Write an enzyme that holds these catalytic residues in place. Structure first.
Site, PDB file in Angstrom:
ATOM      1  N   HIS A 109      63.478  43.214  65.119  1.00 49.07           N
ATOM      2  CA  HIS A 109      63.362  44.051  63.935  1.00 49.07           C
ATOM      3  C   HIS A 109      64.741  44.458  63.444  1.00 49.07           C
ATOM      4  O   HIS A 109      65.644  44.713  64.246  1.00 49.07           O
ATOM      5  CB  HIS A 109      62.529  45.299  64.222  1.00 49.07           C
TER       6      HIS A 109
ATOM      7  N   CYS B 294      77.230  57.944  54.971  1.00 42.06           N
ATOM      8  CA  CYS B 294      75.870  57.517  55.272  1.00 42.06           C
ATOM      9  C   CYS B 294      75.747  56.915  56.666  1.00 42.06           C
ATOM     10  O   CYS B 294      74.646  56.888  57.224  1.00 42.06           O
ATOM     11  CB  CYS B 294      75.400  56.503  54.231  1.00 42.06           C
TER      12      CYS B 294
ATOM     13  N   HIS C  43      70.502  49.702  56.316  1.00 39.17           N
ATOM     14  CA  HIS C  43      70.577  50.947  55.564  1.00 39.17           C
ATOM     15  C   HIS C  43      70.265  50.693  54.095  1.00 39.17           C
ATOM     16  O   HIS C  43      70.791  49.757  53.487  1.00 39.17           O
ATOM     17  CB  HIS C  43      71.962  51.567  55.721  1.00 39.17           C
TER      18      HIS C  43
ATOM     19  N   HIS D 174      85.500  51.043  61.785  1.00 41.62           N
ATOM     20  CA  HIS D 174      86.160  51.934  60.834  1.00 41.62           C
ATOM     21  C   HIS D 174      87.230  51.119  60.120  1.00 41.62           C
ATOM     22  O   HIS D 174      88.305  50.875  60.672  1.00 41.62           O
ATOM     23  CB  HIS D 174      86.760  53.148  61.534  1.00 41.62           C
TER      24      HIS D 174
ATOM     25  N   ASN E 137      67.554  56.140  48.324  1.00 35.24           N
ATOM     26  CA  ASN E 137      68.703  56.213  49.224  1.00 35.24           C
ATOM     27  C   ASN E 137      68.724  57.596  49.858  1.00 35.24           C
ATOM     28  O   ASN E 137      69.398  58.510  49.387  1.00 35.24           O
ATOM     29  CB  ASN E 137      69.994  55.918  48.472  1.00 35.24           C
TER      30      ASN E 137
ATOM     31  N   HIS F 104      62.317  51.491  48.138  1.00 37.26           N
ATOM     32  CA  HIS F 104      61.306  51.686  47.105  1.00 37.26           C
ATOM     33  C   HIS F 104      60.646  53.055  47.228  1.00 37.26           C
ATOM     34  O   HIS F 104      60.582  53.817  46.257  1.00 37.26           O
ATOM     35  CB  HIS F 104      60.260  50.574  47.200  1.00 37.26           C
TER      36      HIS F 104
END
Ligand SMILES: CCCCCCCCCCCC
Ligand SMILES: CCCCCCCCCCCC
Lengths: 360, 396, 403, 347
Positions: free
Chosen positions: B288, B151, B292, B230, B325, B321
């Site tokens: 802002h 992702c 994720h 990582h 995902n 919402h």
């Protein structure tokens, strides 16, 4: 086994475009009194009406249609209390079926025993009420082509006229239009909502031509003639005719049936039974003569075409029998008669009708 | 003059986020909670415990009633084929690309770099190959297709683009972030591998980046930073999100029990590498935040760690919402949200955080090139009015 | 000082191929022709025509008896699982990486960029994450995993590495290129997705590139050019090598009948695009054989090598590496080029200043060329994939191999 | 749920040719099946890859055990020969998750060992018929069963014994008119198998040292068994014996028949049968079958069987006690059986 005529069906769901809101929908006493009966309506369309129509094309109007019929995608919920249709969008169940074995004509010429039970898929409500679809729409594609639309409709949701209106609104939206007690009491069923099959009653479909109907009326409208003929050839105490109210259009599913108890042609021609919360049944309770002649099943417009056959039947029939009368396929008006009787009575009716019009 | 000869010559180029188009799933695809549970009961008849687990996981996930799933997953036996996955990929990618090309007026012959990231679906020819064929791109295009990178790969793509834009002057880079979820559906009953079924939904985004000076006024943002982490070196943090097979030969993404804690650690490391860079204690460094949308639990953890307010972590909750995902492309839906509420003022710092398998955790910092006007072509065009909705603790 | 400073700041960095290690399959997995045909007959019993097609296209494939397949295709029928694919990925990639780290003496912490390349195997977490876990690379490593890009992806990866070394000074980039065969076996019987079963064999390569000045005298090569072509706009060139399901529900790689023409057109366009950059002023049908010392044609098959030898007029001694790699290791996919190089370094032909032209074709339809310049004269070694058989080569490859 | 794979020699043979002497062609129709048993301690988690690794080097010294039968291009019915095309031996992997090693050891007759040793006839597709099948059956208890199906054209039973012996050694790490016993039979074309004209059945039984001593007193194990069986059946028997000398012999045939009929009583015109032609009394006597060690553990039990038996029937005797496998065509099957059931309660 006619039930095996269809080999493999794909099940999916269709839901309203706009989330209804999970609002409750109380059911009237009449609705809870017919929570055991179901409508099976099968429409047939030739190859022209299905010219280049895919699954998505058929399923597309369903979202708007269920946006209108917001209760057709609801589910039965209970607070022991009285059930209500929670409007949570479980959707209607779409069933794609393929009949490569046979064609529409073969179906029209095949025996009527267990004939359309495999064209209009759909179970009853239960034993898991909270997850039981109220409407099953089955699109069946045959070998040579053509499409059969089979609607299994929970009668608690609405009367058969509501189902016909559902199908008609589906077709219109696809075209482009912009929107001796009469009622028996029986043992509790819990949360399965299905009348037990105490006997082995059989179902059969009869076809009557204009000439035959007008000829057999001499010894006695079309409905009165057929009802009187069936009563005379069947009894060889009361009849509960049902008429409904066809003054509806662009409306949500409603249950507004009209009963008429007659204690034979004259008897045919010319309400507080439900107490509060029992389990009732009136179809096949006192020889109901349900009709849909006041409907427009053959008025559907699919790709500028009309259905070649419409068959309406009732599930949950009681112990007496149900006679369904429907308008015939235009031309020379005919009459489709889907009727369920106990085996012996059905055999006697078949024998008499074969003697008279060679119908069997 | 020697200062100029050593400053301008060795100055990094400025990379601009010219525009981006988020995919808007069809308004006739939503997957309500009740329908999901009905289908789940139908697929898992013999595993009531799996059904109960799925219901518990989905009733506290923060998702809404408008999330979309592919047509192939609609059937109560969900049969994902290669053709279905390719069709969904075409649908989403071409919709996003068409929206991007109409927004920016970019010609296909102007695309110099093309990076497509999609973890699970890795066809042959690649997804970048189908984009090139669809838009007849130039025969000397720098076409990259990243897969298996999770992702966070979204931000990875951005990083790659940035680097390439430093080497090639006057170039445009199209970055297509997506997750085709037809092949990602788990056809089994192992509880650990059923989370992706409950949480992952359809989405996508096509982004245009450019170092061209003619875009110094059209550009929406200007990429400031891209930090990467990582944690694959740690053995525990490597097996966190592991694709594998269950005891029946079905491939699915097993999620470790400790997936929370490790995730936390990764995020912390990232905010230790992005802190000094933005240091003139992050709720005041940026204007802002785009966390994720990997589940309300991780968003809650980040909110409690960074001490973000309800309104600061609001695009992430509302994106989870509305869309669920959507994987690496979620970072962009959040962006749209902030733009469409009229909160994207000029000079505002946006911090995107994307954490995924590997266990990778990347973040990016953008600066608002120009004040963003509310628009009608966007994934929030209709539901933006209702939001911010009140997301309940438990749904039924 | 002004012009000198401008030139120094404007000059591109030098990328050096410090070294590279190729996977050497153990002598336990080799698949002779007879055994392959016997397993084919046992598996595809129902459809004799598919077996006859496989025999016809494998008896004139130009392979040998030493090509290797993973320990999942050995069975009857093969059982390719995720665990088997991961095990093969470990076996190949870790072996190649260990060979690279022992050859170059490279500390894992010194690796700044890691580009892994595998077409049809894309696990999660990626293979790059697998390498990072195995060798404990750093947490700020620029790790990329390219997949789905076919056989030419091997020259894509290095290209990307170059573009990343010119942005990051004093850095090392490790490029791993492989093709895991376990998630690559067609389990059907259609005569269109069986050719990849016959040709593809297991192999891999790991490559260390670096722009550091310390890795300048010891560097084996200097990357001169990388030219990419993508005949993807054309529908025929896009569908020529297409991954799809058959009539039974098995994924495979269908190859169109008009694939030789498409590959020839892609090669022609690539060589046209690269001709200006390498051809001497004398030539500017200019002779490509007069601009390069060594050629590494991708070992995709005998047909393409014959086509290139007929077009470029390459002598039989310049396509020797391609033919011999095809015979020995088979169609190892993107890593095939890195075997071919090792053939011209072991017979002993890598003189200082020599030019190497590697051409790799693949799906997309992609076609990529790379031009290297031998930095230092390279001496024969015994830690190469050709160590135990280079003495017997070159062999005479017969047109037809009897079963 | 058996699994079939192939094993090929590590070193390519280059498509050599092995000429089959007239003896081999005559006796090509028979097949040896040898099953060995190993206890729990002999295994302690042996991976199939570990088991298969020694075979790669072993096949180098037994290269002929990887070739395939073929006929010369001169004619379609020429002299068969073994082409060393490196087809490889057929490795079978089987798991017995229902029965233990002891249960199989106590398991009685009616194809006890057929399930334990995969095999197939050389045909009707000679060009792709494996000559050697090696099956590893891992039992739920932990012990293994090694079943070797060995085409008799490849070699005699002692050749298979040497094959498995060298396998074990390299696993341990060691560096590698009516009187004629041979009968002409109707040709079988390219399918090497003998149909059974009667109810051809086999039975295996073991004699303990005590009963062997008792029978010897009543009368060596060879003579005692021969006399006992012959008298029981009575109430030509040509005997097959080993040459008597060997040291790491390769795949060959050195059997001897006794009345020692000269081997020059046959041609290549048709097919021939030796085992079971006239009440054969094959006797191996001494053999390293029990002398081998796997992880230091000797085999619990070894059993040999012959497939392609003649009409009259065969008797195979091996040193255990002593294991005897008798294959008979007719109701004598029952007759002799009942005799044993009355003396040693064998049934
Ligand atoms: C238009 C309605 C689509 C409904 C999709 C339901 C998906 C069910 C997923 C089952 C999870 C186990
Ligand atoms: C050492 C064993 C090598 C066995 C190789 C056989 C590979 C089977 C290929 C099946 C193709 C149909």
């Amino acid at each position: 086994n006619p039930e095996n005529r269809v080999s493999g069906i794909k099940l999916s769901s269709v839901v309203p475009a706009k989330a209804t809101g999970n609002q409750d929908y109380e059911l009237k006493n009449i609705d809870l009194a017919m929570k055991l009966h179901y409508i099976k309506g099968v429409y047939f369309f030739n190859r022209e009406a299905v010219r280049g129509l895919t699954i998505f094309d058929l399923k597309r109007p369903m979202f708007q249609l269920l946006d209108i019929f917001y209760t057709a995608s609801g589910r039965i919920r209970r607070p022991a209390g009285r059930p209500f249709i929670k409007c949570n969008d479980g959707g209607v169940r779409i069933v794609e079926a393929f009949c490569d074995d046979q064609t529409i004509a073969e179906w029209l010429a095949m025996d009527h025993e267990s004939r359309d039970d495999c064209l209009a898929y759909g179970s009853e409500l239960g034993p898991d009420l909270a997850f039981s679809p109220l409407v099953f729409v089955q699109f069946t594609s045959f070998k040579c082509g053509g499409m059969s639309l089979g609607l299994s409709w929970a009668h608690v949701l609405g009367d058969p006229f509501s189902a016909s209106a559902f199908v008609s609104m589906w077709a219109q939206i696809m075209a482009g239009r912009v929107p001796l007690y009469p009622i028996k009491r029986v043992d509790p069923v819990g949360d399965h909502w299905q009348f037990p099959n105490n006997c082995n009653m059989k179902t059969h479909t009869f076809q009557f031509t204009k000439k035959q109907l007008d000829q057999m009326a001499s010894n006695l409208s079309h409905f009165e003639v057929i009802s009187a003929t069936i009563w005379k050839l069947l009894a060889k105490g009361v009849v509960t005719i049902c008429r409904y109210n066809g003054q509806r259009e662009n409306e949500t599913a409603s249950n507004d049936m009209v009963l008429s108890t007659a204690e034979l042609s004259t008897l045919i021609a010319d309400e507080k039974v439900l107490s509060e919360s029992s389990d009732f049944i009136m179809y096949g309770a006192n020889l109901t003569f349900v009709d849909m002649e006041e409907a427009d099943v053959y008025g559907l417009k699919l790709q500028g075409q009309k259905p070649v056959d419409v068959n309406y039947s009732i599930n949950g029939v009681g112990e007496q029998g149900v006679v369904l009368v429907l308008a015939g396929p235009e031309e020379d008006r005919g009459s489709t008669v889907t009727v369920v009787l106990p085996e012996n009575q059905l055999e006697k009716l078949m024998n008499e009708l074969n003697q008279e019009w060679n119908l069997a | 003059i020697f200062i100029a000869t050593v400053y301008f010559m060795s100055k990094p180029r400025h990379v601009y986020l010219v525009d981006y188009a988020c995919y808007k799933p069809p308004v006739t695809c939503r997957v309500p909670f009740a329908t999901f549970m009905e289908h789940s009961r139908l697929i898992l008849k013999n595993n009531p415990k799996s059904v109960e687990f799925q219901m518990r996981i989905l009733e506290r996930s923060g998702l809404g009633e408008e999330t979309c799933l592919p047509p192939a997953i609609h059937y109560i036996p969900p049969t994902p084929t290669m053709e279905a996955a390719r069709g969904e990929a075409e649908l989403v990618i071409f919709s996003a690309m068409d929206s991007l090309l109409q927004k920016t007026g970019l010609k296909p012959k102007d695309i110099d770099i093309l990076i497509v990231n999609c973890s699970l679906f890795s066809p042959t020819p690649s997804l970048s190959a189908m984009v090139i064929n669809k838009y007849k791109l130039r025969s000397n295009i720098k076409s990259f297709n990243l897969s298996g990178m999770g992702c966070s790969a979204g931000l990875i793509s951005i990083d790659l683009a940035r680097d390439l834009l430093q080497v090639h002057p006057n170039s445009n880079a199209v970055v297509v972030s997506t997750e085709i979820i037809t092949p990602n559906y788990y056809q089994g009953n192992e509880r650990a591998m059923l989370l992706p079924n409950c949480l992952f939904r359809m989405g996508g985004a096509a982004i245009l980046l450019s170092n061209r000076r003619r875009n110094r006024s059209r550009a929406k943002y200007r990429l400031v930073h891209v930090v990467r982490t990582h944690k694959g070196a740690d053995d525990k943090a490597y097996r966190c999100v592991f694709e594998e097979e269950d005891k029946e030969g079905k491939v699915g993404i097993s999620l470790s029990k400790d997936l929370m804690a490790i995730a936390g650690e990764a995020l912390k490391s990232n905010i230790t590498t992005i802190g000094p860079l933005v240091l003139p204690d992050f709720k005041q460094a940026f204007e802002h935040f785009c966390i994720h949308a990997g589940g309300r639990a991780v968003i809650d953890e980040l909110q409690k760690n960074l001490q973000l307010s309800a309104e600061q972590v609001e695009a992430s909750r509302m994106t989870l919402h509305r869309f669920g995902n959507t994987s690496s492309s979620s970072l962009w839906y959040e962006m749209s949200y902030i733009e469409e509420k009229g909160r994207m003022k000029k000079g505002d710092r946006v911090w995107q955080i994307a954490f995924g398998s590997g266990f990778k955790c990347n973040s990016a910092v953008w600066k608002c090139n120009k004040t963003i006007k509310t628009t009608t072509d966007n994934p929030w065009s209709d539901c933006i009015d209702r939001y911010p909705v009140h997301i309940p603790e438990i749904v039924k």
